[PDB]
């Protein structure tokens, strides 16, 4: 059993895709362990979440996008949940994300890509503690 | 603009219909304003939520059901949200709920009926204050 951190991004809200995204994960039989709705996440939180990208040219624009609307943070639990949810999510790059994946079916941009999911056990622990410090 | 309180009930988690239900409200263009996941709601909030029914024969069994699994409490905002979401919800009695409604399509029991929605302006204020004391 593993736990992974998922963010539903502001573009899901703008486009009314929140349920569509959550439903894909729900249909694969992952269970919600914690969940938090943010009318607007604090920029500091976003900066921490993306600390590993701080030197990338897109860092600030991505932070702006991530505070541009609401977010839902969710901790999902299930056997190999981290890798499995990453496969459902689909690749970041719109030239690569596979039809059948969340990004492959629904996302058309490298930034506005609807959903974050932890990429490893090490980052899951980190991200979960950022969004759910308790 | 109005705000209404919705509970996603434990039978929705059991039957994996959480997204399906939230999705119907999202497609109607209502906006999440607050949201909290409860792994198990405290008995006292449930009894206060249903205080109107405290002397009814079904009170204890209903309360028991409502703590039998997780729930999500959500505040939705929109023009005439209270009456419109109630219309989406459908009649408590499965002999009466209309196809096209949440309960008409999905519920088959007077108690395990998937969703709560505030029935009036006054009850919405009260229920919001219970679940989001803030
Ligand atoms: N390569 C790239 N990444 C971007 C850009 N703009 C924003 N990002 C964001 O940086 C976030 C974190 O990147 P990464 O860990 O590689 O992607 P993810 O795990 O698939 O979300 C991604 O979700 C992108 O939204 C861009 O212009 N180029
Ligand atoms: N067994 C039983 N349970 C009931 C009955 N009426 C209401 N309940 C339960 O009490 C909850 C609140 O009832 P009510 O406000 O009338 O219905 P609602 O607004 O449609 O949820 C319902 O969701 C049912 O679980 C009934 O006639 N029999
Ligand atoms: Mg990443
Ligand atoms: Mg009622």
UniProtKB/Swiss-Prot annotation, chains A, B:
ATP binds at residues 9, 58, 86, 103, 113. Gene3D superfamilies: Nucleoside diphosphate kinase-like domain. The gene is NDK. Plays a role in the synthesis of nucleoside triphosphates. This activity may optimize the replication of the AT-rich (73%) viral genome in a thymidine-limited host environment. The active site is at residue 116. GO terms for biological process: CTP biosynthetic process; GTP biosynthetic process; UTP biosynthetic process. It holds the Pfam family NDK. Its cofactor is Mg(2+). Coiled coil: none annotated. Keywords: ATP-binding, Kinase, Magnesium, Metal-binding, Nucleotide metabolism, Nucleotide-binding, Phosphoprotein, Transferase. This is Nucleoside diphosphate kinase. PROSITE patterns: NDPK, NDPK_LIKE.
